[PDB]
């Protein structure tokens, strides 16, 4: 506890840096607080950001894998933004893209995720990633 998220959240462009930026926090009683600084001494939330295009194979496969992870990894935040609404001129050549944030900072930039494990990606390929 806390069982904070439990599902994949939709992101609109105006709130991208709110929902992703908000990786930089814990909550009350999840860490030490000090004089004139209420921030937890520990790290923040792992946020898995999916930049998707509905037309692409891997995007469809990942929508399944991301929600399936969300159902078990209750403490991990999973979000999805249409790729075309995240990056101006998002190129199809990078599609799909996964960026992993932590404590407000960028941890992974995985591009054309069809090669991140099997072409027919299984939860085994995604759970092997999530533990790295």
């Amino acid at each position: 506890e806390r069982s904070k998220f439990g599902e994949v959240f939709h992101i609109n462009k105006p709130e991208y840096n709110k929902e992703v930026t908000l990786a930089s926090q814990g909550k009350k009683y999840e860490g030490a607080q000090t004089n004139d600084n209420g921030e937890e001494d520990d790290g923040g939330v792992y946020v898995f950001v999916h930049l998707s295009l509905q037309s692409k194979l891997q995007s469809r496969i990942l929508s399944h894998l991301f929600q399936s992870a969300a159902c078990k990894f209750r403490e991990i935040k999973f979000v999805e933004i249409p790729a075309n609404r995240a990056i101006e001129n998002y190129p199809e050549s990078n599609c799909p893209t996964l960026i992993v944030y932590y404590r407000g900072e960028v941890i992974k930039n995985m591009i054309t995720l069809l090669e991140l494990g099997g072409n027919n990606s299984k939860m085994e390929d995604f759970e092997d990633f999530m533990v790295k």
């Binding site: 194979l57 469809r60 496969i61 399944h64 027919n120």
Partner: protein
């Protein structure tokens, strides 16, 4: 094609009507028929379904295919809803319903092209459906020719054809058929239904498979607790006392715990606790019982009286088994001895008579056999074979065969399958149409011809020449019906179907291809309902 962008009638979306809609609906139904065709009959071929992600599944189950099939058409989804309703009501045969509906819609469209109004087609099809229902009722039969004849024996052999037991099916089928036929009963309120669970299976390594025995009685899956009691008592005449009241050592009080250090007081408390059960046991011994069956178990201390009295006690007995044994032996399971203000078993009032009761040793768990009841009509199957692996395989095969034969028996009103109904209805409706006219003859004839799709599809799925088999089936049915007015038949008989394994026309009643009347009636009625619903759509608007 693709009629759209009308120059007039500016509405909120595109609109079409008439022959275009009729042709589109016919094409959609033909597309669905193409998907469901290969799944008809036991010899059908598997089809693979692929999603938008990349996963796929393979199966020949028509219901599953239709449930997972992606159909995007206002008229196409009618067939999917039809199949779902049939699965809810019948649970099987959706492929035949869909094929019949598609053929009926195609023939109705052909009639429409022949200047036949849709309403006339619907009326004629409904008249044909009513006549077909009447004929089906006329050709119904109950569970007959099942004892002493190869009717359910072939069913068991077919179910056993895919298992090791197939080699000795010639005998195991007879065993299972006799076991399930004997247990015929009215069930509840004259429902006329065979028991849901019956015919226990046992394993043995003696002799061979052909020596498998049918126990003339019941069997209990438990032990006799202490080994000091005889395993077989009173071979000439053995009585069984069935009691539900527990014989386990009772407590002085439910809410009082015994913490006593005085030997005398401990002895008194133990004497009372053991004496309650000893009196309960004595109420059975005084009745002259030789075997005691207790559902809630028997304690070791109270078994001393039985051991001295040479009475075999049984613990952890099943309530249903004891009730059945008591009823078959003329006794009744005693729910409790606390009648009014007394405590007794009514000696000689609830004791059943049996010819022989013996603890029989078998593979894995042992059991106690109760044989020689006054009227039980049940039996247990003892499996014999070369080794334990064969015995277990035969046990599973016997379970499957009993399940299928019980399903067949429970249907007290069945009709021959394998295309018999379809061909007979085709011939009957062809004859009937020649006496109606009034613009309904064409519709009735087309409806009759529609039913011929099922036998044709079955023959095609059998890798045989469908034309020849269907023609022979039609000739046999016509010959059978033509002799009806003469009230004499020597070579003309009905109930002939299509053998999809040997590619021959055989009597399905003897072969073992029968289906319940409700299944066929609902299939035909729902197929016609779906066809009518599709035909009633002559305008489509997409906003």
């Amino acid at each position: 094609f693709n009629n759209s962008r009308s120059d007039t009638l500016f509405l909120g979306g595109e609109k079409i009507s008439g022959d275009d809609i009729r042709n589109q609906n016919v094409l959609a139904t033909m597309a669905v028929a193409n998907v469901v065709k290969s799944s008809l009959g036991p010899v059908g071929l598997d089809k693979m379904l692929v999603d938008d992600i990349g996963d796929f599944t393979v199966t020949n189950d028509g219901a599953t295919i239709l449930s997972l099939l992606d159909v995007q058409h206002p008229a196409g989804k009618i067939l999917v809803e039809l199949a779902q309703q049939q699965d809810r009501e019948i649970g099987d045969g959706t492929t035949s319903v869909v094929i019949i509906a598609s053929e009926l819609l195609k023939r109705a469209n052909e009639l429409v092209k022949n200047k036949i109004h849709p309403t006339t087609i619907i009326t004629g099809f409904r008249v044909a459906l009513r006549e077909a229902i009447r004929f089906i009722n006329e050709v119904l039969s109950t569970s007959v020719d099942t004892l002493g004849k190869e009717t359910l024996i072939n069913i068991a052999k077919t179910s056993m054809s895919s298992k090791i037991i197939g080699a000795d099916s010639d005998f195991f089928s007879n065993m299972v058929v006799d076991a399930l036929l004997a247990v015929k009963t009215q069930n509840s309120k004259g429902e006329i239904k065979y028991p849901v669970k019956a015919v226990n299976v046992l394993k043995a390594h003696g002799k061979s498979a052909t020596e498998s025995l049918l126990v003339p009685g019941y069997a209990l899956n438990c032990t006799v607790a202490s080994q000091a009691m005889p395993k077989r008592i009173a071979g000439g005449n053995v009585k069984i006392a069935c009691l539900d009241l527990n014989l386990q050592k009772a407590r002085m009080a439910m809410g009082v715990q015994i913490n006593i250090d005085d030997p005398e007081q401990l002895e008194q408390i133990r004497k009372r606790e053991a004496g309650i059960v000893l009196e309960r046991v004595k109420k059975i011994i005084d009745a002259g019982a030789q075997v005691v069956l207790t559902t809630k178990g028997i304690d070791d201390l109270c078994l001393k009286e039985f051991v001295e009295a040479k009475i075999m006690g049984v613990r952890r007995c099943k309530k249903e088994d004891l009730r059945r044994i008591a009823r078959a032996t003329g006794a009744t399971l005693v729910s409790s001895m606390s009648n009014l203000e007394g405590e007794e078993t009514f000696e000689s009032s609830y004791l059943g008579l049996c010819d022989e009761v013996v603890q029989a040793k078998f593979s894995d768990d042992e059991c106690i056999l109760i044989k020689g009841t006054s009227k039980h009509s049940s039996s247990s199957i003892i499996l014999r074979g070369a080794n334990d692996y064969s015995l277990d395989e035969m046990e599973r095969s016997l379970h499957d065969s009993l399940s299928v034969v019980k399903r067949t028996l429970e249907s007290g009103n069945v009709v021959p399958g394998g295309g018999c109904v379809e061909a007979a209805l085709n011939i009957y409706l062809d004859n009937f149409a020649t006496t109606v006219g009034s613009r309904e003859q064409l519709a009735i004839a087309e409806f009759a011809a529609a039913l011929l799709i099922i036998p044709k599809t079955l023959a095609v799925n059998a890798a045989k020449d469908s034309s020849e088999l269907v023609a022979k089936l039609r000739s046999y049915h016509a010959a059978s019906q033509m002799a009806k007015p003469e009230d004499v038949k020597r070579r003309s008989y009905r109930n002939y179907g299509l053998d999809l394994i040997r590619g021959k026309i055989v009597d399905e009643i003897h072969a073992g291809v029968l289906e319940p009347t409700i299944s066929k009636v609902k299939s035909l009625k729902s197929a016609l309902e779906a066809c009518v619903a599709i035909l009633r759509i002559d305008t489509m608007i997409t906003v």
